[PDB]
Each structure stands twice: as structure tokens, then as C-alpha cells.
Tab-separated table of C-alpha atoms and ligand atoms in Angstrom:
chain	number	residue	atom	x	y	z
A	1	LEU	CA	10.182	9.373	-24.595
A	2	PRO	CA	10.189	5.562	-24.150
A	3	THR	CA	6.862	3.813	-23.556
A	4	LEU	CA	6.087	3.367	-19.859
A	5	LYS	CA	4.043	0.436	-18.579
A	6	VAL	CA	2.655	1.402	-15.174
A	7	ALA	CA	1.330	-1.376	-12.941
A	8	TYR	CA	-1.242	0.020	-10.513
A	9	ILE	CA	-3.839	-1.326	-8.089
A	10	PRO	CA	-7.544	-0.706	-8.870
A	11	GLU	CA	-8.346	1.040	-5.584
A	12	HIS	CA	-9.598	4.416	-4.380
A	13	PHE	CA	-5.908	5.278	-4.002
A	14	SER	CA	-5.495	5.125	-7.786
A	15	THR	CA	-7.915	8.028	-8.225
A	16	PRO	CA	-5.212	10.653	-8.927
A	17	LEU	CA	-3.762	8.356	-11.600
A	18	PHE	CA	-7.150	8.291	-13.325
A	19	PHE	CA	-7.668	12.062	-13.320
A	20	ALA	CA	-4.166	12.528	-14.724
A	21	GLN	CA	-5.341	10.520	-17.729
A	22	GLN	CA	-8.741	12.218	-17.867
A	23	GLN	CA	-7.136	15.663	-18.018
A	24	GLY	CA	-4.460	14.376	-20.386
A	25	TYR	CA	-1.553	15.276	-18.113
A	26	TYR	CA	0.414	12.269	-19.369
A	27	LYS	CA	0.187	13.251	-23.036
A	28	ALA	CA	1.002	16.806	-21.959
A	29	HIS	CA	4.319	15.530	-20.599
A	30	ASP	CA	4.852	13.710	-23.899
A	31	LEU	CA	4.228	10.292	-22.355
A	32	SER	CA	2.913	7.028	-23.779
A	33	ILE	CA	1.550	5.219	-20.727
A	34	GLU	CA	0.166	1.680	-20.764
A	35	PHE	CA	-1.517	1.046	-17.414
A	36	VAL	CA	-1.559	-2.543	-16.159
A	37	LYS	CA	-4.318	-3.325	-13.660
A	38	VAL	CA	-3.029	-5.526	-10.838
A	39	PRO	CA	-5.793	-6.659	-8.435
A	40	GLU	CA	-3.456	-9.311	-7.011
A	41	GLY	CA	-1.697	-6.681	-4.905
A	42	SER	CA	1.793	-5.335	-4.247
A	43	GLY	CA	3.195	-8.863	-4.260
A	44	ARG	CA	2.589	-9.190	-7.989
A	45	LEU	CA	3.688	-5.601	-8.625
A	46	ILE	CA	7.180	-6.609	-7.519
A	47	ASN	CA	7.112	-9.722	-9.704
A	48	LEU	CA	6.107	-7.648	-12.731
A	49	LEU	CA	9.088	-5.367	-12.095
A	50	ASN	CA	11.528	-8.264	-11.730
A	51	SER	CA	10.279	-9.809	-14.976
A	52	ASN	CA	10.576	-6.498	-16.833
A	53	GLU	CA	6.897	-6.750	-17.776
A	54	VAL	CA	6.321	-3.264	-16.355
A	55	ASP	CA	8.424	-0.125	-15.908
A	56	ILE	CA	6.756	1.370	-12.833
A	57	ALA	CA	4.765	0.005	-9.895
A	58	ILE	CA	2.637	1.733	-7.257
A	59	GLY	CA	1.874	-0.336	-4.164
A	60	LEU	CA	2.235	-0.637	-0.398
A	61	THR	CA	5.445	0.713	1.135
A	62	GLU	CA	6.303	-2.243	3.376
A	63	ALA	CA	6.182	-4.532	0.338
A	64	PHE	CA	8.963	-2.745	-1.541
A	65	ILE	CA	10.993	-1.966	1.582
A	66	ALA	CA	10.980	-5.609	2.674
A	67	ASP	CA	11.850	-6.941	-0.778
A	68	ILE	CA	14.812	-4.574	-1.073
A	69	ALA	CA	16.027	-5.311	2.452
A	70	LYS	CA	15.780	-9.035	1.694
A	71	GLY	CA	18.263	-8.859	-1.175
A	72	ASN	CA	16.419	-7.720	-4.298
A	73	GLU	CA	18.793	-5.075	-5.659
A	74	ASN	CA	16.713	-4.692	-8.825
A	75	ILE	CA	13.937	-2.790	-7.041
A	76	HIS	CA	14.083	0.966	-6.445
A	77	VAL	CA	11.778	3.176	-4.383
A	78	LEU	CA	11.519	6.469	-6.260
A	79	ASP	CA	9.086	8.531	-4.191
A	80	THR	CA	6.104	8.538	-1.825
A	81	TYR	CA	2.654	8.262	-3.405
A	82	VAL	CA	0.538	8.527	-0.254
A	83	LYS	CA	1.863	10.458	2.741
A	84	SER	CA	-0.900	9.329	5.103
A	85	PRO	CA	-0.649	5.881	6.760
A	86	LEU	CA	-2.840	2.845	6.081
A	87	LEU	CA	-5.606	2.019	8.556
A	88	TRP	CA	-5.692	-1.652	9.542
A	89	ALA	CA	-8.806	-3.002	11.250
A	90	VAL	CA	-8.666	-5.915	13.689
A	91	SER	CA	-11.718	-8.112	13.114
A	92	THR	CA	-13.347	-11.259	14.484
A	93	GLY	CA	-16.566	-13.245	14.100
A	94	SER	CA	-19.700	-11.119	14.395
A	95	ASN	CA	-21.088	-13.681	16.840
A	96	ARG	CA	-17.835	-14.319	18.711
A	97	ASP	CA	-19.122	-13.469	22.187
A	98	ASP	CA	-15.831	-14.841	23.510
A	99	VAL	CA	-13.838	-12.162	21.680
A	100	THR	CA	-14.774	-8.736	23.045
A	101	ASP	CA	-11.416	-7.033	22.492
A	102	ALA	CA	-7.895	-7.340	21.085
A	103	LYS	CA	-6.879	-8.476	24.567
A	104	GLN	CA	-6.013	-12.117	25.273
A	105	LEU	CA	-5.835	-13.061	21.589
A	106	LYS	CA	-4.265	-16.430	20.784
A	107	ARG	CA	-4.789	-17.629	17.208
A	108	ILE	CA	-4.068	-14.832	14.730
A	109	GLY	CA	-5.373	-15.337	11.202
A	110	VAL	CA	-3.297	-14.135	8.260
A	111	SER	CA	-3.402	-14.470	4.476
A	112	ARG	CA	0.276	-15.410	4.225
A	113	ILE	CA	3.395	-15.465	6.389
A	114	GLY	CA	5.198	-12.171	5.836
A	115	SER	CA	2.103	-10.459	4.455
A	116	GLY	CA	0.601	-7.217	5.741
A	117	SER	CA	-1.887	-9.017	7.974
A	118	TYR	CA	1.071	-10.879	9.477
A	119	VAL	CA	3.507	-7.991	9.922
A	120	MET	CA	0.890	-5.677	11.441
A	121	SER	CA	0.133	-8.256	14.141
A	122	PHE	CA	3.522	-7.398	15.637
A	123	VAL	CA	2.649	-3.698	15.681
A	124	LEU	CA	-0.633	-4.537	17.404
A	125	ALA	CA	1.064	-6.576	20.131
A	126	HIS	CA	3.716	-3.894	20.630
A	127	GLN	CA	1.167	-1.129	21.217
A	128	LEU	CA	-0.834	-3.462	23.464
A	129	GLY	CA	2.238	-3.920	25.650
A	130	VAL	CA	2.168	-7.673	25.102
A	131	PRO	CA	4.689	-10.118	23.577
A	132	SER	CA	4.472	-10.841	19.845
A	133	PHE	CA	1.940	-13.434	18.696
A	134	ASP	CA	3.249	-16.900	17.831
A	135	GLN	CA	0.153	-18.818	16.718
A	136	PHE	CA	-0.583	-17.849	13.116
A	137	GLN	CA	-3.281	-19.327	10.879
A	138	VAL	CA	-2.707	-19.172	7.120
A	139	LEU	CA	-6.066	-18.684	5.395
A	140	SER	CA	-4.701	-17.629	1.990
A	141	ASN	CA	-7.337	-14.984	1.209
A	142	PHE	CA	-9.650	-12.429	2.831
A	143	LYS	CA	-12.728	-14.610	2.307
A	144	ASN	CA	-11.272	-17.443	4.388
A	145	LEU	CA	-10.176	-15.010	7.102
A	146	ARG	CA	-13.799	-14.053	7.769
A	147	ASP	CA	-14.991	-17.667	7.753
A	148	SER	CA	-12.153	-18.543	10.126
A	149	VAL	CA	-13.064	-16.008	12.817
A	150	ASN	CA	-16.706	-16.991	12.318
A	151	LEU	CA	-15.693	-20.608	12.939
A	152	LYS	CA	-17.366	-21.818	9.741
A	153	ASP	CA	-16.770	-25.141	7.984
A	154	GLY	CA	-13.934	-25.592	5.502
A	155	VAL	CA	-11.283	-23.712	7.464
A	156	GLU	CA	-9.561	-23.847	10.850
A	157	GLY	CA	-10.786	-21.455	13.530
A	158	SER	CA	-8.982	-18.307	14.645
A	159	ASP	CA	-9.445	-15.546	17.219
A	160	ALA	CA	-8.844	-12.490	15.033
A	161	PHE	CA	-7.236	-11.156	11.860
A	162	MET	CA	-6.128	-7.810	10.443
A	163	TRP	CA	-7.136	-6.211	7.144
A	164	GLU	CA	-7.497	-2.744	5.609
A	165	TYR	CA	-10.366	-0.900	7.305
A	166	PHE	CA	-12.471	0.329	4.378
A	167	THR	CA	-12.200	-3.120	2.793
A	168	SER	CA	-13.483	-4.631	6.038
A	169	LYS	CA	-16.150	-1.966	6.543
A	170	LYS	CA	-18.436	-3.633	4.002
A	171	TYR	CA	-18.462	-6.726	6.202
A	172	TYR	CA	-19.062	-4.723	9.370
A	173	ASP	CA	-22.209	-3.286	7.802
A	174	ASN	CA	-23.581	-6.650	6.655
A	175	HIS	CA	-22.926	-7.974	10.166
A	176	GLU	CA	-20.572	-10.709	8.962
A	177	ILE	CA	-17.640	-9.579	11.107
A	178	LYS	CA	-17.102	-7.126	13.964
A	179	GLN	CA	-14.332	-4.657	14.796
A	180	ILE	CA	-12.383	-5.056	18.037
A	181	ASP	CA	-9.520	-2.661	17.299
A	182	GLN	CA	-7.791	-0.415	14.753
A	183	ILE	CA	-4.092	0.109	14.026
A	184	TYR	CA	-2.326	2.635	11.801
A	185	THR	CA	0.872	1.799	9.936
A	186	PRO	CA	3.951	3.559	11.372
A	187	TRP	CA	4.945	4.374	7.790
A	188	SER	CA	3.329	6.074	4.803
A	189	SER	CA	0.995	3.705	2.960
A	190	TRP	CA	1.852	3.988	-0.754
A	191	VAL	CA	5.041	4.596	-2.752
A	192	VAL	CA	6.286	4.706	-6.346
A	193	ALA	CA	8.793	2.056	-7.427
A	194	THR	CA	10.696	0.917	-10.518
A	195	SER	CA	13.377	-1.514	-11.694
A	196	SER	CA	17.110	-0.964	-12.167
A	197	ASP	CA	16.608	-1.503	-15.899
A	198	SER	CA	13.673	0.873	-16.376
A	199	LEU	CA	15.341	3.515	-14.209
A	200	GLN	CA	18.574	3.236	-16.195
A	201	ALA	CA	17.100	3.242	-19.703
A	202	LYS	CA	13.978	5.327	-19.081
A	203	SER	CA	14.916	7.850	-16.382
A	204	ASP	CA	13.736	11.053	-18.076
A	205	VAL	CA	10.371	9.553	-19.016
A	206	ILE	CA	9.858	8.342	-15.442
A	207	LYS	CA	10.445	11.875	-14.170
A	208	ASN	CA	7.737	13.303	-16.422
A	209	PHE	CA	5.402	10.582	-15.163
A	210	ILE	CA	5.938	11.523	-11.519
A	211	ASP	CA	5.290	15.162	-12.421
A	212	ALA	CA	2.154	14.020	-14.244
A	213	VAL	CA	1.119	12.149	-11.099
A	214	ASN	CA	1.768	15.348	-9.153
A	215	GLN	CA	-0.751	17.252	-11.273
A	216	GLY	CA	-3.195	14.363	-10.984
A	217	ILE	CA	-2.935	14.647	-7.212
A	218	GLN	CA	-3.522	18.398	-7.424
A	219	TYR	CA	-6.637	17.840	-9.528
A	220	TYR	CA	-7.855	15.307	-6.972
A	221	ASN	CA	-7.399	17.719	-4.067
A	222	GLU	CA	-9.273	20.396	-6.015
A	223	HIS	CA	-12.062	18.047	-7.108
A	224	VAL	CA	-12.882	15.828	-4.128
A	225	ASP	CA	-16.567	15.617	-5.060
A	226	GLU	CA	-15.642	14.476	-8.567
A	227	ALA	CA	-13.308	11.894	-7.031
A	228	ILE	CA	-16.102	10.618	-4.793
A	229	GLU	CA	-18.376	10.350	-7.824
A	230	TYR	CA	-15.680	8.449	-9.721
A	231	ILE	CA	-14.869	5.988	-6.936
A	232	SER	CA	-18.503	5.172	-6.164
A	233	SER	CA	-19.250	4.690	-9.868
A	234	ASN	CA	-16.237	2.725	-11.110
A	235	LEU	CA	-14.764	1.112	-7.996
A	236	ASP	CA	-16.100	-1.301	-5.380
A	237	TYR	CA	-17.142	1.365	-2.872
A	238	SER	CA	-20.381	3.086	-1.880
A	239	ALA	CA	-20.830	6.857	-2.024
A	240	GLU	CA	-20.762	6.946	1.778
A	241	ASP	CA	-17.538	4.970	2.228
A	242	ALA	CA	-15.888	6.896	-0.606
A	243	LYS	CA	-16.830	10.126	1.171
A	244	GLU	CA	-15.314	9.097	4.509
A	245	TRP	CA	-12.258	7.672	2.747
A	246	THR	CA	-11.268	11.057	1.308
A	247	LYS	CA	-11.215	12.472	4.844
A	248	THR	CA	-8.453	10.069	5.882
A	249	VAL	CA	-6.217	10.127	2.809
A	250	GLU	CA	-3.420	12.573	2.031
A	251	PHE	CA	-1.556	12.072	-1.239
A	252	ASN	CA	1.995	13.378	-1.619
A	253	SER	CA	1.394	16.735	-3.304
A	254	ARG	CA	5.162	17.242	-3.164
A	255	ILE	CA	5.926	14.097	-5.160
A	256	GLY	CA	8.817	14.688	-7.555
A	257	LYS	CA	9.431	18.074	-5.945
A	258	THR	CA	10.809	17.021	-2.561
A	259	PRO	CA	12.746	13.883	-1.532
A	260	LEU	CA	10.724	11.260	0.352
A	261	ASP	CA	10.830	11.169	4.156
A	262	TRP	CA	13.533	8.649	5.070
A	263	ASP	CA	12.371	8.095	8.650
A	264	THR	CA	8.712	7.562	7.771
A	265	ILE	CA	9.411	5.397	4.712
A	266	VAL	CA	12.624	3.495	5.456
A	267	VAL	CA	13.496	3.615	9.164
A	268	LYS	CA	10.140	2.886	10.820
A	269	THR	CA	9.328	0.274	8.173
A	270	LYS	CA	12.688	-1.447	8.658
A	271	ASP	CA	12.254	-1.566	12.438
A	272	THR	CA	8.830	-3.189	12.093
A	273	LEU	CA	9.879	-5.747	9.477
A	274	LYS	CA	12.800	-6.803	11.670
A	275	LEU	CA	10.444	-7.082	14.641
A	276	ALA	CA	8.264	-9.374	12.528
A	277	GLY	CA	11.318	-11.508	11.787
A	278	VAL	CA	10.989	-10.771	8.076
A	279	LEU	CA	14.514	-9.347	7.956
A	280	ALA	CA	17.147	-11.850	9.082
A	281	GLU	CA	20.164	-9.955	7.742
A	282	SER	CA	22.275	-7.618	9.887
A	283	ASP	CA	21.470	-3.943	10.476
A	284	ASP	CA	24.428	-2.712	8.420
A	285	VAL	CA	23.600	-4.862	5.390
A	286	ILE	CA	19.893	-4.013	5.519
A	287	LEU	CA	20.560	-0.280	5.791
A	288	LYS	CA	23.195	-0.586	3.063
A	289	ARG	CA	20.706	-2.159	0.654
A	290	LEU	CA	18.148	0.531	1.499
A	291	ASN	CA	20.584	3.422	1.036
A	292	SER	CA	21.275	2.390	-2.560
A	293	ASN	CA	17.743	1.419	-3.606
A	294	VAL	CA	15.675	4.120	-1.898
A	295	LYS	CA	15.922	7.555	-3.516
A	296	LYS	CA	17.132	10.395	-1.300
A	297	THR	CA	16.662	12.871	-4.146
A	298	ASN	CA	14.192	13.649	-6.925
A	299	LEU	CA	14.890	12.631	-10.522
A	300	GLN	CA	16.686	15.244	-12.619
A	301	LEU	CA	17.362	15.628	-16.340
A	302	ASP	CA	20.919	15.550	-17.689
A	303	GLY	CA	22.606	18.843	-18.545
A	304	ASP	CA	22.691	20.149	-22.110
A	305	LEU	CA	26.493	20.079	-22.243
A	306	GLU	CA	26.477	16.532	-20.865
B	1	CA	CA1	-25.439	-13.310	20.638
B	2	CL	CL1	21.458	-9.430	-3.893
């Protein structure tokens, strides 16, 4: 089977991928995997796929759904990696006595326009029963977002920003920022993606990988304690946070065995992205591009007589 270069993100979510290697599930499926650590995020994962530098990518769902719906016909969503949604925390300055809730927010801080922190602001407003926010502050990175809400020097001030909870929890504990709200993603958090080229020339090997990921997920579910020990010893998370994290996460134990949920992966995500103004194209064209790039079935091997 062709060599597969898998671009992943060094997070607690990548735990099953690690155990699959530890238990040698990959080699068991006759696979030669070359993992490519991508701390930059899902944004770079897509770039690595488009440049043919990697065969497979595992990142946030909304990233791959948006890119496909925006025109990129070289990206394919194969299956769901994490069935449970992502928890976004709404934060502000720890000493912002003027900001006591997510109510009456004006200046919303975001890393980039069209990013997760930006798109989720529309979900926040929707659930709050208030019009979408219009004043966005681009702070580039997470570091600046905290300084912004804290009204520190070097950056423009902002009322609040959104960021993954467990990532923000560290800064709740050190009293650098405070939580004013929490919002779940309407969709499942993580998915498995590939390129048109890798899927066309390396289909069979990709299937075995997904099955290998399936066993890795099974090992995780049957060895939570070992996963906690791994995360709090190799990743940027304490034993406590790693413990609570496992209580909120549900990997797709049916990955490769059952088609992904279209409503919870495509529909809800599409509706949100369009609400955020990320998708300017018509409904028919968007849905058309999603119907051909998002798998409605699991990968299968060709027949012997074929
Ligand atoms: Ca005070
Ligand atoms: Cl196109």
C-alpha cells in the first residue's frame, strides 16, 4: 500500500491516533504512515492537502466544510473523527468589571475574519436572541486576544472573544481572563479529510487507515486512564484538565463502518457559515459542492473480478 502522510494536530484529540501507533494497528493494516505535526491549525491542514504535501488531514469540521463550499473541489470529507461538539468559551478581561455577561457586547475580538472565533460569534448572538455582531477586532493570535480584553498596551481594546474552553481554562485558573459564557458548536468537532489526488491514487490505503483509527479509538475508550496519563505527560495539559476533558469527548467509534451524519456535519455547518457571511454563493451551488465532496458512504475495496 502507498505511503500515507497524515497531517494531524498535536492536541488531546489526537490521542487515539497515538495509541493506534503504540499498539501497531497501522503496521497491522500494512500501512506506512508518516505523521506530520501541524500546530498551526486546520487552516494549514487544508493548505498541505492542496499542495499535495500530505495525503490525509484531521482538523475542525467547519474548516473543511467552508473551504469546500467556497469552491475548493480538491478537498474531500471522508468521515467524522469526533462525534461530540467543540466547546467554545466566551472570555473577557479578568478585571473587566464593566463586562459581567455576554449581554450588551460591542467589540468582539477574533484571531482572523472567517476563523472559528469569528464564525462562533454569530452562533452566540443567535442563541442570545440578538442581532449579529458587526464590530470585530482582528488580534491575529490567542495571546493578543487576552491582552485585548484586558485592555493592555500594544493592542486595541475589545469587550470579549471566543476560544476553545480547555485552551482558555489555563488562563481562567491563573486569573488572567474570566468566563462570561459558553457555546457548543452545532456540528461535530473533528473530521477526516483528504485530497482528490490522494483519494484517487491511494483509496485502499486510506480505508485501512480509517479502520486503524477505529481500533485506536476503541483502545482509547478502553484505556481512559492510560489516555489521561499520556495527555498530561506529552501534551500541554494538566492531569486534572485531561481528566475532565475525557468526560466531554466522544470519538466516532463507528468511523469507517457507518456513513457520517449529513445533518450534523454538512447541514448545520452550512447554515452557520452562511449566517456568518462566509458563504456568498447560492444555496444550490453550495449544496452541490458539498454533495460531491462530502462522503455519504464508507470507503470500499474494488471487487476481485474488477
Ligand atoms: Ca476589582
Ligand atoms: Cl471550483
